[PDB]
Structure formats: structure tokens, C-alpha cells
Amino acid sequence: XISXXISXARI
Amino acid sequence: XISXXISXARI
Amino acid sequence: XISXXISXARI
Amino acid sequence: XISXXISXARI
Numbered sequence A, B, C, D: 001x002i003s004x005x006i007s008x009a010r011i
Helices: none
Strands: A003-007 B002-007 C003-007 D003-007
């Protein structure tokens, strides 16, 4: 039900 | 660098 | 520079 | 009844 994620700090 | 998610057992 | 997010645990 | 998934570590 949970969906999503992260990135973009160093990249 | 992650994407996705989980759940759905009881709901 | 970060992109992405979370939702879906109970909702 | 489960939905969702994982990926993004290496790719």
C-alpha cells in the first residue's frame, strides 16, 4: 500500500 | 535509489 | 535535488 | 492480497 521512494541527494 | 512499496495482507 | 516521496501504509 | 514491490538498489 506503501509506495514510493527516494533519491537525489548526491545524485 | 529505491522505489516501491508493500502491504495488503489484512488490507 | 531530491525527488520522490512516500505514502500508502494505512491509506 | 499483497501488492507492491521492490527495486532501485543496483538499478
